[PDB]
């Protein structure tokens, strides 16, 4: 355990949050990093115990606290409530990839096995100083703008059969999701404005789910795969959550998860020929914080046009108990927190140090 340093291709002049933060938090990236491929080397990579995750977590919180300041921040303390009030300027907010790099004397091992699901032996190991850049996206249910798998969709659950852990499946193809505000639609309720619509290609969704259920079927060979919505909980979990600029969006993903594949077929979409699965979204001012337990309020919406363009690169799916089920397994998209989002990106890297002094017996004797 050491502390890694960050690097990014900061611009530092657009007064955007990530560039402003990066200006003083990070160094320039390495223009010519080297990579050494090791030969017959096997290494155990445990993504669930990778401490790089906690370090990434701390840097992201600092970025957020130094930028997206709420008007009101409520922190319970045990059990009174502490209220912090701050100026509420809006800021430009667009993630930049950030690289993590080893300090002198350390190196990072990388797992290059495209079929490795984690928690075990990686049979292709190389060494680098820096990881690739990762975009610090904060979201739930569907993770966004991450890396893609080289060939196939990969399930990376710590334990397929535990039911208290996520699936965090990553995709080998990104699916574009386009969320827009109905610009210039200004309407108010009385004794709307806060609306958005997200369009998902139905074709991509259908292909993606067919491939996912095939993998789930391999894990559960005698069962039908059925998808559902959440059972309840905080809005950030029940609906899909993301942000762009200073706007925090909540989208109803029900239209994406009501299928049941068994013979790799559902007809969940009636060949509706619409070609678009659309989600109803809302923009909120009072949200639950992801940064530990607490609540926060942000200033009301920007008067112009807001657009988000994202790549669905994985699903933080979970599974039901299954104990009382007969021939069917139920999956639900609701779930995720930030540590899980980083585990899905940092699983390929481990930091180690060489200890050059070793002992072995041999045939020589020292003359005495």
């Amino acid at each position: 355990t050491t502390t890694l340093f960050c690097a990014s291709d900061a611009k530092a002049y657009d007064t955007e949050v990530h560039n402003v933060w990066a200006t003083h938090a990070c160094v320039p990236t390495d223009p010519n990093p080297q990579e050494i491929v090791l030969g017959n080397v096997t290494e155990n990579f445990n993504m669930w115990k990778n401490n790089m995750v906690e370090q990434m977590h701390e840097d992201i919180i600092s970025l957020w606290d130094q930028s997206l300041k709420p008007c009101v921040k409520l922190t319970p303390l045990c059990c009174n409530t502490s209220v912090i009030t701050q100026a509420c300027p809006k800021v430009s907010f667009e993630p930049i990839p950030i690289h993590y790099c080893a300090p002198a004397g350390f190196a990072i091992l990388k797992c290059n096995s495209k079929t490795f699901n984690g928690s075990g032996p990686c049979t292709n190991v190389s060494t680098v100083q820096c990881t690739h850049g990762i975009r610090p996206v904060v979201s739930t249910q569907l993770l966004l703008n991450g890396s893609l798998a080289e060939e196939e969709i990969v399930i990376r659950s710590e334990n397929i059969t535990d039911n208290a852990k996520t699936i965090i499946v990553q995709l080998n193809e990104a699916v574009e999701i386009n969320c827009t505000r109905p610009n210039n639609n200004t309407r108010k309720s009385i004794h709307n404005i806060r609306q958005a619509h997200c369009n998902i290609s139905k074709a991509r969704w259908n292909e993606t789910l067919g491939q996912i259920v095939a993998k789930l079927e391999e894990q559960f060979p005698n069962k039908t795969i059925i998808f559902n919505h959440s059972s309840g909980g905080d809005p950030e979990i029940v609906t899909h959550s993301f942000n762009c600029g200073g706007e925090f969006f909540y989208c109803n993903t029900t239209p994406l998860f009501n299928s049941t594949w068994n013979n790799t077929r559902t007809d969940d979409y009636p060949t509706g020929g619409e070609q678009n699965i659309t989600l109803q979204c809302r923009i909120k001012q009072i949200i639950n914080m992801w940064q530990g337990v607490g609540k926060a309020m942000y200033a009301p919406p920007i008067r112009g046009q807001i657009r988000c363009s994202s790549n669905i690169t994985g699903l933080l799916l979970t599974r039901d108990g299954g104990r009382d089920q007969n021939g069917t397994e139920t999956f639900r998209p609701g779930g995720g927190n930030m540590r899980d989002n980083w585990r899905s990106e940092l699983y390929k890297y481990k930091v180690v140090k060489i200890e050059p002094l070793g002992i072995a017996p041999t045939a020589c004797k020292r003359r005495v």
Epitope: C71, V72, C88, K188, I190, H191, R282, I286, M297
Partner: antibody
Framework: QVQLLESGAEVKKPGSSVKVSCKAS????????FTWVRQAPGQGLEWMGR????????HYAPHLQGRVTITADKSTSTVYLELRNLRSDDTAVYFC?????????????????????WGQGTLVTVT | ELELTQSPATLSVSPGERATLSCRAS??????LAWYQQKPGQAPRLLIY???TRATGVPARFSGSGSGAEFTLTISSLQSEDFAVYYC???????????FGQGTRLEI
């Protein structure tokens, strides 16, 4: 559309405290924010402070920060103003006013400054 | 800080005439003004919302506009029931601070 109703009149000895209130009715309490106004004789509509009911948070005019507490009872739809260290300078007609915050319950609160639903005004004096 | 300076508050106007009222800020204010009509013994009802929006149930006679530190209100075809004390208030600060006006009376 809250039929905000005023309380009775009060008289206190200087240095004392007074607590007055308004009852909101006909809609959800949590969907309205409330402020207090003091119509002192010869004055304009002096602002005392503001309370948020979705988030139990309140803000006060600087000259009253060590003297005024604004609270609410979520179960009785009641807005309260407590003023301490009373002076003859505080003789005034006191009242609440509501602001509608649509879908505050779901996190859509705007925190507007437009006062539309007013109480009737209660006189508080000292003696 | 932010203060509101109003017109002389003795506006001599006949019914049927267009009265002109004003609201000057010591600091810039966005369209965060509220104009109210106070009658003796009555609530100071809001008539203009956000410097220019009719607040609901408000006659077209009563209208206004403004920006920065200079805002106005005019009352066209003034009626006898409109000879009220008018207030201009500002809520543009956060943490909240309210400029609550002074009060102007129309006269005749």
């Amino acid at each position: 559309q809250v039929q905000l109703l005023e309380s009775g009149a009060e008289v206190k000895k200087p240095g004392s405290s007074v607590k007055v209130s308004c009852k909101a009715s006909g809609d959800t309490f949590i969907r309205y924010s409330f402020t207090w106004v003091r119509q002192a004789p010869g004055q304009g509509l002096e602002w005392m402070g503001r309370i948020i009911t979705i988030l139990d948070v309140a803000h006060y005019a600087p000259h009253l920060q060590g003297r005024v507490t604004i609270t609410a009872d979520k179960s009785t739809s009641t807005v309260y103003l407590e003023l301490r260290n009373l002076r003859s300078d505080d003789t005034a007609v006191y009242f609440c006013a509501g602001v509608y915050e649509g879908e505050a319950d779901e996190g859509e609160y705007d925190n507007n400054g437009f006062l539309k639903h007013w109480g009737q005004g209660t006189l508080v004096t000292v003696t | 800080e932010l203060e509101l300076t109003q017109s002389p508050a003795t506006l001599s106007v006949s019914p049927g005439e267009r009265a002109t009222l004003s609201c000057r800020a010591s600091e810039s204010v966005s369209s965060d003004l509220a104009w109210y009509q106070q009658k003796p013994g009555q609530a100071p009802r809001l008539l203009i919302y956000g410097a220019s929006t009719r607040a609901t149930g408000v006659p077209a006679r009563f209208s206004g506009s403004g920006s920065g530190a200079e805002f106005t209100l005019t009352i066209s075809s003034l009626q006898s029931e409109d000879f009220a004390v008018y207030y201009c208030q500002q809520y543009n600060n956060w943490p909240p601070r309210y400029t609550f006006g002074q009060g102007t009376r129309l006269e005749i």
